Every structure is written in C-alpha cells, then in structure tokens.
Amino acid sequence: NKCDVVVVGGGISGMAAAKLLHDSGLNVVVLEARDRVGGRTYTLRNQKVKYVDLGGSYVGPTQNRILRLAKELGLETYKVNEVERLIHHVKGKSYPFRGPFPPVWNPITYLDHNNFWRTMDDMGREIPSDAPWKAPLAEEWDNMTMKELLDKLCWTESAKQLATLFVNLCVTAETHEVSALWFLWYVKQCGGTTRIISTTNGGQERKFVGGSGQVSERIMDLLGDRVKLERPVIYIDQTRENVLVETLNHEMYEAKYVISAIPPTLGMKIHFNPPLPMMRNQMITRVPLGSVIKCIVYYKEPFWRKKDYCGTMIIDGEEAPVAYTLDDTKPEGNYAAIMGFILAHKARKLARLTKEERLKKLCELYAKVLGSLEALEPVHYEEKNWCEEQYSGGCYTTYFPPGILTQYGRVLRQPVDRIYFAGTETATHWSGYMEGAVEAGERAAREILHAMGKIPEDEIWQSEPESVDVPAQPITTTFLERHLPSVPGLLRLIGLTTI
Amino acid sequence: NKCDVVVVGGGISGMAAAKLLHDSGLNVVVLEARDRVGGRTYTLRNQKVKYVDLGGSYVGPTQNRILRLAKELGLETYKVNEVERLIHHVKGKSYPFRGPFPPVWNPITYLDHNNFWRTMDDMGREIPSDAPWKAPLAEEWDNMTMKELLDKLCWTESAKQLATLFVNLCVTAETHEVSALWFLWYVKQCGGTTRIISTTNGGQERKFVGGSGQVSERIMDLLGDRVKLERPVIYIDQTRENVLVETLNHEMYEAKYVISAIPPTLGMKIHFNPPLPMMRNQMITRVPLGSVIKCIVYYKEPFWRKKDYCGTMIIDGEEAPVAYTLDDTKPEGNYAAIMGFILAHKARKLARLTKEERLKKLCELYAKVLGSLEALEPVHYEEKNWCEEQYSGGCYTTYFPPGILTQYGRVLRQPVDRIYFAGTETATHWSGYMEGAVEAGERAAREILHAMGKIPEDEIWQSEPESVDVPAQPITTTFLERHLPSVPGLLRLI
Numbered sequence: 001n002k003c004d005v006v007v008v009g010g011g012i013s014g015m016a017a018a019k020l021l022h023d024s025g026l027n028v029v030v031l032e033a034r035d036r037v038g039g040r041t042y043t044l045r046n047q048k049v050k051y052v053d054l055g056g057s058y059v060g061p062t063q064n065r066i067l068r069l070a071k072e073l074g075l076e077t078y079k080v081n082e083v084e085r086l087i088h089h090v091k092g093k094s095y096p097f098r099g100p101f102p103p104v105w106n107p108i109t110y111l112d113h114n115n116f117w118r119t120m121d122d123m124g125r126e127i128p129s130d131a132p133w134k135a136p137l138a139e140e141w142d143n144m145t146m147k148e149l150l151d152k153l154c155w156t157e158s159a160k161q162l163a164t165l166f167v168n169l170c171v172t173a174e175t176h177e178v179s180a181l182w183f184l185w186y187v188k189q190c191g192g193t194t195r196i197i198s199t200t201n202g203g204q205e206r207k208f209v210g211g212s213g214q215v216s217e218r219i220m221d222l223l224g225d226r227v228k229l230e231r232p233v234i235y236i237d238q239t240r241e242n243v244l245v246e247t248l249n250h251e252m253y254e255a256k257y258v259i260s261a262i263p264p265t266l267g268m269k270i271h272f273n274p275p276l277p278m279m280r281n282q283m284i285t286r287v288p289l290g291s292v293i294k295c296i297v298y299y300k301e302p303f304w305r306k307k308d309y310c311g312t313m314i315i316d317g318e319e320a321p322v323a324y325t326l327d328d329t330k331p332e333g334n335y336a337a338i339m340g341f342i343l344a345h346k347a348r349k350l351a352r353l354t355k356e357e358r359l360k361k362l363c364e365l366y367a368k369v370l371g372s373l374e375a376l377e378p379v380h381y382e383e384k385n386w387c388e389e390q391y392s393g394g395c396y397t398t399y400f401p402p403g404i405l406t407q408y409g410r411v412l413r414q415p416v417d418r419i420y421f422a423g424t425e426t427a428t429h430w431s432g433y434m435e436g437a438v439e440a441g442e443r444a445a446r447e448i449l450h451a452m453g454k455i456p457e458d459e460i461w462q463s464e465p466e467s468v469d470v471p472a473q474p475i476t477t478t479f480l481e482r483h484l485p486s487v488p489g490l491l492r493l494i495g496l497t498t499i
Numbered sequence: 500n501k502c503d504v505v506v507v508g509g510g511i512s513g514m515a516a517a518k519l520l521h522d523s524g525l526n527v528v529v530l531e532a533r534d535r536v537g538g539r540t541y542t543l544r545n546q547k548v549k550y551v552d553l554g555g556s557y558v559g560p561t562q563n564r565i566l567r568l569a570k571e572l573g574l575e576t577y578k579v580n581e582v583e584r585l586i587h588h589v590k591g592k593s594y595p596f597r598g599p600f601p602p603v604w605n606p607i608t609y610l611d612h613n614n615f616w617r618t619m620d621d622m623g624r625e626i627p628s629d630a631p632w633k634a635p636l637a638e639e640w641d642n643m644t645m646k647e648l649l650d651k652l653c654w655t656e657s658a659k660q661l662a663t664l665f666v667n668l669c670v671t672a673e674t675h676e677v678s679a680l681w682f683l684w685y686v687k688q689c690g691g692t693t694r695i696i697s698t699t700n701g702g703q704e705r706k707f708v709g710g711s712g713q714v715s716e717r718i719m720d721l722l723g724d725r726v727k728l729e730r731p732v733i734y735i736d737q738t739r740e741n742v743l744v745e746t747l748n749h750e751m752y753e754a755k756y757v758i759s760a761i762p763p764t765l766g767m768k769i770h771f772n773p774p775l776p777m778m779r780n781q782m783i784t785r786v787p788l789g790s791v792i793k794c795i796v797y798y799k800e801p802f803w804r805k806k807d808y809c810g811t812m813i814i815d816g817e818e819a820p821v822a823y824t825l826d827d828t829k830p831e832g833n834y835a836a837i838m839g840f841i842l843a844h845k846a847r848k849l850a851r852l853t854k855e856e857r858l859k860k861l862c863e864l865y866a867k868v869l870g871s872l873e874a875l876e877p878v879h880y881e882e883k884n885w886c887e888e889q890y891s892g893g894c895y896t897t898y899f900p901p902g903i904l905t906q907y908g909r910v911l912r913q914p915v916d917r918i919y920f921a922g923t924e925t926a927t928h929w930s931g932y933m934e935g936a937v938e939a940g941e942r943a944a945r946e947i948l949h950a951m952g953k954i955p956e957d958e959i960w961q962s963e964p965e966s967v968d969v970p971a972q973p974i975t976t977t978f979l980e981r982h983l984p985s986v987p988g989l990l991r992l993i
C-alpha cells in the first residue's frame with residue numbers, strides 16, 4: 001500500500017532501480033505483471049537442458065554495469081565457444097573464416113564492404129549518444145529507412161546482402177521498417193560495428209553460468225515481499241499529493257514517485273490521470289518492438305567442433321529459417337546445443353508451423369550449412385517466440401520507424417510530473433541490452449534521489465569502472481581500412497586519370 | 500452486468516453497431532471511456548459559434564451509409580461554400596483558380612503534375628480495396644515510403660511539393676512516415692485522387708446542419724441508459740462461458756460477444772485473458788494515428804467572397820502554419836469563419852505556442868493569402884489539438900509505416916474468439932472517415948448476427964443504395980490527361 005517509490009516492471013531495469021533505492025534507505029515496491037521477474041530475460045530449468053536462456057543471454061566487454069551488478073549478486077560468466085572457425089553461408093554454400101567479418105576476395109567488392117562498415121561508423125560519430133536528434137543531418141537521416149541507405153551506399157549486391165543480415169540480426173527488424181538515423185545511433189551507442197557484431201571482444205563474448213534470469217531473481221531475493229508478482233499496473237493518478245498506482249487484481253499503491261521500467265509502448269496498457277502530455281501520448285503508439293523466435297537444438301555432442309567449426313553460422317538466403325547461430329553448449333562441454341534466431345518477417349512467417357516442424361527445418365538447415373548428417377539427430381529442442389508476449393511486445397528491443405526519433409525522441413526519458421522512466425530503451429550505452437537496462441534503472445532511481453534532495457544533480461549520471469574480469473580491447477583499424485576509396489571514390493579517381 | 504453484446508467505444512462506429520444490434524432485438528451495452536460520445540467527432544456549442552465541428556465534419560457523394568444513417572436520425576446537410584475561386588499560394592503569391600487541381604503553365608511541370616496524379620490512380624487500380632496486401636506488387640510498394648515514391652515519380656520540385664501537401668492533408672502524416680502501398684490503397688478506397696480531394700462532387704462537399712456530433716448523440720438518445728459514459732474498458736476475459744468485460748471504474752459486464760470499436764492501437768489499453776494471438780499482439784503496437792490541430796477563425800463577415808474567393812486555400816511551404824483551409828461559414832451566411840488544419844510535424848511544432856499565439860499566426864497567414872487586412876480582425880477562435888487525446892491517439896485516422904500493411908494488415912478485421920472489430924480503420928470504402936465508421940460498425944454487428952445464426956453469411960457485407968440528396972456524378976478525364984507522356988516519357992521520344 002504506502003511507500004516511497006513504486007517501480008512498475010520487474011525486469012533487470014526495474015530490479016536495478018529498486019535495489020539502488022532500497023540500498024539508499026527508501027521503501028520501494030516493485031509491481032510486476034507476470035508470475036516471475038526477469039521480463040525479456042527468462043532462464044528455463046528442466047532436466048534435459050539443466051538451464052537455458054530463452055531471452056537475453058549475452059554480455060561482453062564494455063558492458064560494465066551488468067557485469068558489476070551480476071558480480072555483486074554472486075554470478076559468474078563463461079566465454080561462448082569461438083575456438084574453431086566461423087561459417088558464412090551464402091548462395092547455398094559454406095565458407096569458413098576467422099575474424100569479425102567474412103573475408104572478401106574480389107578487390108571491387110572488398111572496397112565496397114570496407115567502405116560500408118567504415119561509413120556506418122563514420123556516420124555514427126556524428127550522432128550524440130544522449131541526443132541523436134542533435135546530429136547535424138538528423139532530419140535527412142531520420143527521413144530514410146535503412147533500406148534506402150543501403151541502396152545508396154552499397155555498390156555491390158554482396159555488401160547489400162550482408163548489411164541486410166546485419167540490420168536484421170542487430171534489431172530484429174527489416175531494413176525497410178527502421179529509420180537510418182535510429183539504426184546508426186543504435187550501433188554507435190554499442191561501440192560501433194565491430195563491437196556489436198563480435199563474439200570475442202564484443203557483445204556476444206560471454207553468458208552467465210546458470211542463466212541471466214538469476215540477476216532479477218537474486219534481486220527479488222534481496223527485496224523479499226517488496227516484489228509483488230501478478231500485479232499488472234492499469235492506472236496511475238497524479239492529481240493528488242501522493243501518486244496512486246492501481247493494479248488489475250484490484251490493489252492500490254500510494255507513493256511519492258513512480259519509475260516506469262517497462263518497454264515504452266507498453267505504457268499504453270496504463271490509463272493516466274491526468275492524461276499524458278501530447279508528445280508522450282503519441283510517442284508510445286509509434287515505437288514497436290522487433291520480432292524473434294529464439295530456438296535451441298540439443299545434440300549428444302558438439303559435433304561441429306570435430307569439423308573445426310565453432311558453431312557460429314551467418315546464413316544468408318530467404319529459404320533459411322535461421323540467419324545466425326552460436327554454440328550454446330555448457331562450459332563443462334555437455335548439453336551440446338546450437339542457438340539460432342529466426343528474425344523479423346521469418347518470425348511472423350514461421351510462427352504458423354508446429355514446434356516439431358520448426359525443429360525439422362532448423363536441423364535440415366544446420367545439416368546443410370555444417371555439411372553434417374549428425375545435425376539431423378537432435379536429442380531435445382527448446383524455443384520461445386517473443387512476439388506472443390503481452391507484457392514484452394517483442395524482442396530484443398524497441399525500434400524507431402522513419403521520422404519518429406527526431407520528432408518524439410526528446411521525450412523518451414523526460415519525467416512526467418512524478419513519473420520517471422527506466423527500461424533499456426532509455427539508456428545511452430547499450431540501449432536494447434541487459435547493460436542498458438542497468439544504466440537506465442539506476443539513472444532513473446538517482447533522478448528520484450535528486451528530486452528528494454538526497455544527492456546533487458551531478459550524481460544523476462554516473463560513470464562505471466571497467467570490469468577487471470572482462471576487460472575491453474580497443475577497436476582498431478589499419479591504414480588501408482581507413483584510406484582505401486569507396487567504389488564511387490575509385491570511379492572518381494578513374495574519371496580523373498582519364499581527364 | 501448481463502447483456503447480449505458489449506460494444507467498446509461510443510464513436511460513430513460503435514454507435515452504428517449498437518443501433519443495428521438493438522434494432523434487431525438484442526440487448527446491447529456501449530462502454531465509452533469519455534464523458535461524451537462521438538470520439539473523433541466533437542461538436543462544440545456556444546453563443547459565439549452556434550455550433551462548430553472540432554473533429555470530423557465533411558461528408559460527400561459516394562458516402563451513402565453515413566448519409567442514410569444521419570438522415571434516419573433527422574439530420575440535414577448543407578454545401579461547403581465553393582461558389583467563388585479557390586487559391587493556390589506558392590512561393591509567396593496567391594494564384595486563384597477553379598476546378599479541383601491548381602493550373603500548371605510550364606509545359607514540363609504540366610506533364611510532371613499530370614503524370615503524378617494519373618500514376619497514383621493507375622497504381623490504385625491494382626490494389627484490392629478489401630485486401631491491399633493482395634496487390635501484385637504489394638511487397639515492393641509496402642517496403643517504400645511515400646517520400647521514396649514521390650522522389651522516383653516527380654521530375655519537378657513543383658509536383659513533389661504539391662504531392663507532399665496532398666499526402667500531409669489526406670493522412671495527417673509526413674510522406675516519409677507512411678507506406679506507399681498503404682497510402683495508394685487509402686486514396687483508391689476513397690474513389691481516387693479527384694474524389695478524395697474535391698469539395699464539389701468529392702469528400703468535402705457537405706457538412707451536417709448542427710454538427711456531426713449529432714450522429715453519435717442521437718444514437719445515444721435512442722439507446723438511453725444502455726450507453727455508459729466514463730467506463731474505459733481495462734480487461735477482457737474470454738476464458739469462461741460468457742465474455743467478461745471490466746471497466747476502470749470497477750464495473751463488470753457479461754456478454755455473449757464483444758465489438759471493439761476503438762482505433763486499433765488503443766486495444767493496447769486493454770489487458771487480455773487469454774493473451775491476444777501473436778499477430779494482433781504485435782499489430783496494435785505498429786499502427787499510429789496522425790497529427791492535426793483543427794482551427795476555426797471567426798469574422799464579422801465572409802469578406803473573402805467580395806474578392807471572388809470562396810475561402811479554400813492550398814498553401815505551400817514550411818513557414819505557413821496551415822496548409823489547407825475551407826470556408827466554415829454557416830449556410831445562412833452568418834458566423835463567418837475559415838477552417839484550417841495544422842498538419843503532421845507542424846502540429847507537433849506549433850503545439851508549444853499558446854492559443855492566442857496560434858491565432859495571430861493564422862490571421863497573419865490568411866491576411867497574406869487572401870490579400871485582405873480584414874483577416875487581422877478575428878471576432879472569435881476555436882481549436883482542437885487531437886494529438887493530446889488519450890482515447891483517440893490522434894486524427895484523422897491510423898496510418899501504416901513501411902512494411903506493416905503486408906505483414907499485419909490481414910489481422911485488422913480478424914475476430915479473436917468472440918471479439919469482432921469495427922472502427923473506421925477496418926472499413927473497405929472511406930476507411931478513415933465517418934462513412935467507414937458506419938460501414939465497419941454495421942459489418943461487425945452483422946458478423947455477430949451471423950455467428951448467432953440469425954442471418955446467412957452473404958448478408959454480412961451489404962451494399963448501400965445511393966443517397967437521393969447527395970448523388971454522385973462521374974469522375975472524368977480528358978484525352979490529353981490520359982495520353983500526355985510523363986517527363987521520362989517525353990525524354991524517350993528524344
């Protein structure tokens with residue numbers, strides 16, 4: 001009933017906010033719609049898999065907040081398998097490789113690929129992490145889709161196809177669905193193209209031993225009965241001295257302040273009194289989440305390793321249900337498994353099938369890509385289609401269609417009276433990830449501490465010491481990567497020698 | 500508590516559905532979130548204006564359902580003034596004209612403009628009104644914005660600027676916000692470019708005497724205490740024998756079936772048990788409504804008529820707050836007024852001003868465009884910013900960003916167990932309009948009558964006889980309009 005702060009949502013962001021407030025001596029309550037905490041993280045436990053992350057799983061260098069929070073809760077990481085070769089499967093054939101990107105041998109195609117990644121990062125440097133609408137060409141870039149930008153930048157079909165797969169995997173959406181400004185912001189605020197796509201030295205380097213759901217569960221353990229499960233919030237009333245928060249199961253909570261720690265569009269599920277200001281009222285109808293089915297196929301052994309494949313497959317082509325896989329074998333070497341994502345329109349297309357039908361298509365694909373009949377012999381299968389979740393809306397995160405980020409982006413984390421906004425979507429570093437959820441939950445909690453006169457303004461945003469366990473190597477380029485011309489740059493050089 | 504059908508939403512579509520079900524002898528209840536009926540229609544009455552439509556207002560030929568429904572309820576229409584010349588204001592100068600499109604004189608610009616409109620209608624012919632995702636090029640057209648299509652089709656800036664104004668005024672959204680397939684469908688399902696943009700013989704021909712809010716109000720009068728105001732629906736449970744519908748003010752309604760007659764995205768405000776199917780769960784997060792402030796400036800007389808201007812202005816350019824106006828004077832020549840729309844990004848930009856600051860900007864604009872100091876002497880002002888409305892989400896209607904109509908369009912009308920979907924967004928003719936609200940509410944009602952075994956399947960969708968009061972005249976084209984080449988066409992012959 002009565003408290004200092006109600007936190008709406010018990011995902012990592014709400015849990016990190018509640019913990020900070022609790023540790024600071026305030027009385028907090030977390031109102032969580034589901035019968036569990038964790039939100040877009042979910043660790044399933046059963047005897048066939050031991051444990052498996054069906055939602056968010058990976059962490060890596062530069063994600064220092066989630067690493068610190070998880071360490072403090074007694075959790076450990078291990079490295080995703082990348083010992084053996086990666087595979088790029090394109091036009092029905094597999095090409096093994098090492099390094100962040102498949103090698104390109106054709107010199108023209110090489111210039112085009114090099115220029116594409118370079119230009120993504122060059123554009124990103126123009127876009128402030130905390131205010132992307134302030135980029136010099138924000139309007140021009142927000143008024144085109146990523147499809148339009150790829151059409152302009154890629155002088156080869158090879159580059160355009162790889163770039164397409166890159167966008168679909170990063171943000172679980174099609175290139176024509178998303179704003180170019182927003183996508184360029186999203187990549188830059190994860191540290192750039194190499195950092196976002198990499199396993200070793202990148203976002204996919206590690207997983208938590210025992211699953212990421214432990215982060216939210218262990219914070220629930222610390223907070224005790226302060227976390228109220230099966231309490232979907234339906235109504236927030238700020239017309240009186242204390243804020244009133246009502247739940248679906250007929251309970252009323254009264255607080256000094258509220259943190260909204262849910263995906264922005266899911267604010268639609270709450271009726272507000274007084275009504276939200278115009279810009280937020282419309283913003284929350286303009287910000288969908290992406291579409292993904294996360295699928296894990298189990299085998300007797302990690303047989304791909306014997307063929308010198310690590311289990312990472314980048315798979316192009318419309319017929320392939322899964323465009324990206326990673327080895328999901330336990331660190332002990334047992335419960336061998338391949339994790340794959342069914343992305344964007346394919347999540348919609350293939351949701352029609354049964355579980356058994358999707359397992360069959362995945363095994364047939366993996367058998368072809370790995371050149372291995374053993375892939376047709378799974379021992380177990382788990383999957384989760386995040387598009388079906390009422391209290392998530394999709395995964396991994398919210399995308400912005402053309403025109404929205406410049407017109408409505410300013411209000412995403414703007415307080416509304418005594419409501420402050422957390423959730424990974426409001427982060428400025430690794431927004432969309434477990435890391436961004438921690439950044440945003442703690443920042444929102446500190447906004448409230450500042451409102452209460454407990455901390456000064458300069459303490460609202462707080463830097464994070466680098467993890468000693470997962471240090472980050474710098475992202476570097478070569479002289480030739482920096483200075484080689486693009487294809488039109490080369491054509492201009494050719495024109496000039498002729499003139 | 501108990502009834503045959505609960506209708507969620509008391510706009511025109513919910514009211515038309517509830518009236519049809521009531522007239523067939525079912526017990527209906529309408530649950531309306533607001534303290535009023537009418538939704539995206541709203542008629543304000545006061546002594547200064549008598550009455551004024553601050554939401555949807557115009558009706559015209561081919562909109563036979565809304566005309567028949569209003570006539571039955573005792574309403575009359577009058578014609579929007581279009582006796583004198585229209586104005587196109589471009590690069591700071593007014594050019595008066597007659598007919599529905601402004602004249603173009605330069606021969607290259609002429610071919611470009613002619614080809615733009617012609618091509619919009621040619622593309623529309625391949626898009627089924629009841630299934631735009633079945634167009635032969637559905638995916639190609641859905642994956643581009645209208646901005647990308649205009650960049651391809653328009654070889655002149657003049658055409659691109661007017662086409663941009665056209666998109667902004669039709670769907671209160673920017674060309675780069677909307678799918679080309681969806682926008683092309685939207686125009687075709689209103690009868691094409693001439694029909695949607697025209698006052699005489701088009702969508703804006705008429706208004707209702709006393710205001711369009713009277714349609715919802717008079718159905719509420721018929722239904723009496725069956726209409727429950729200040730009952731926002733929060734929860735719908737379909738796990739039991741009868742459907743259970745819960746409101747924010749802690750009431751529970753039990754029915755055999757439910758009609759959802761709210762904008763699609765506003766289904767987000769309801770918690771569902773069991774959860775919605777995947778495709779609808781995601782669809783209702785992908786379908787925003789547009790942005791508009793409707794503004795009405797009143798004057799002592801309709802002074803523009805003395806200069807042989809009817810009050811219609813098409814005003815190009817970024818600086819102008821209002822890109823389109825119509826004369827809003829009453830049929831008797833009194834309560835002289837100009838109605839203008841502040842569209843799309845300008846609604847967002849100018850919402851930060853005060854009401855008095857917006858009034859000054861509009862009057863100065865109108866003084867320039869009408870070439871009249873009389874425009875600087877307003878006697879009254881009313882406006883409504885629809886972006887502020889929790890229970891509308893915007894106006895006039897829902898738009899589809901690129902990629903969404905092909906991936907999710909099929910779900911809009913699909914029943915979910917015993918919930919059927921009305922609302923103008925689900926119509927197949929004049930979706931977005933009061934006409935579409937009536938088509939969809941009556942079709943959803945007849946889906947339920949069919950589920951109850953009261954009518955056969957072939958009576959779910961019903962034709963509408965043409966209005967005797969507002970007959971349609973044919974849309975025609977000239978030989979030259981049909982056959983003049985495009986710009987790249989003339990370049991092939993060169």
Ligand SMILES: *Cc1cc2c(cc1C)nc1c(=O)[nH]c(=O)nc-1n2C[C@H](O)[C@H](O)[C@H](O)COP(=O)(O)OP(=O)(O)OC[C@H]1O[C@@H](n2cnc3c(N)ncnc32)[C@H](O)[C@@H]1O
Binds near residue numbers: 039055269391423
């Ligand atoms: C789904 C997914 C996500 C994901 C990913 C793969 C998939 C399939 N891969 C990731 C990865 O490897 N590494 C990483 O860091 N992130 C990746 N993600 C994204 C990650 O899971 C999310 O960024 C993160 O979990 C988001 O956390 P946040 O706390 O911001 O949001 P949430 O988890 O959605 O939590 C919101 C909670 O709110 C409850 N809710 C919703 N509505 C209400 C109402 N009305 N009332 C009360 N509670 C509400 C939700 O139930 C949820 O618990």
Ligand SMILES: *Cc1cc2c(cc1C)nc1c(=O)[nH]c(=O)nc-1n2C[C@H](O)[C@H](O)[C@H](O)COP(=O)(O)OP(=O)(O)OC[C@H]1O[C@@H](n2cnc3c(N)ncnc32)[C@H](O)[C@@H]1O
Binds near residue numbers: 531539885
């Ligand atoms: C806003 C606007 C609309 C408009 C226009 C100009 C403006 C500024 N110009 C028009 C015109 O000249 N001619 C025309 O035919 N239409 C034009 N429009 C659009 C027109 O107003 C709309 O197409 C039509 O009114 C839509 O009717 P519909 O019945 O489909 O939808 P609605 O009016 O939005 O009604 C929905 C009702 O539902 C209530 N609601 C919302 N959520 C809930 C919940 N959770 N529970 C219960 N009730 C709910 C809303 O309050 C509303 O009354």
Ligand SMILES: CCCCCCCCCCCC[N+](C)(C)CCCS(=O)(=O)O
Binds near residue numbers: 152153154155488
């Ligand atoms: C007789 C000589 C004519 C040769 C002129 C060549 C025509 C150039 C067309 C190639 C388009 C390439 N893409 C990548 C699709 C678009 C680039 C965008 S941008 O042009 O760089 O702005």
Ligand SMILES: CCCCCCCCCCCC[N+](C)(C)CCCS(=O)(=O)O
Binds near residue numbers: 650651652653654987
């Ligand atoms: C001897 C040199 C001849 C000069 C010819 C120059 C022509 C360049 C202008 C083309 C741009 C026109 N837009 C409308 C933007 C694109 C058309 C779309 S599409 O080309 O039909 O795809």
Ligand SMILES: c1ccc2oc(-c3ncc[nH]3)cc2c1
Binds near residue numbers: 086163165166199324
């Ligand atoms: C496009 C789409 C998916 C991709 O995954 C990588 C990658 N995985 C591990 C190192 N680089 C690179 C890459 C490029």
Ligand SMILES: c1ccc2oc(-c3ncc[nH]3)cc2c1
Binds near residue numbers: 698811813
């Ligand atoms: C672009 C934008 C707005 C427009 O309004 C008309 C119009 N109004 C009455 C007859 N034609 C034509 C037109 C073209």
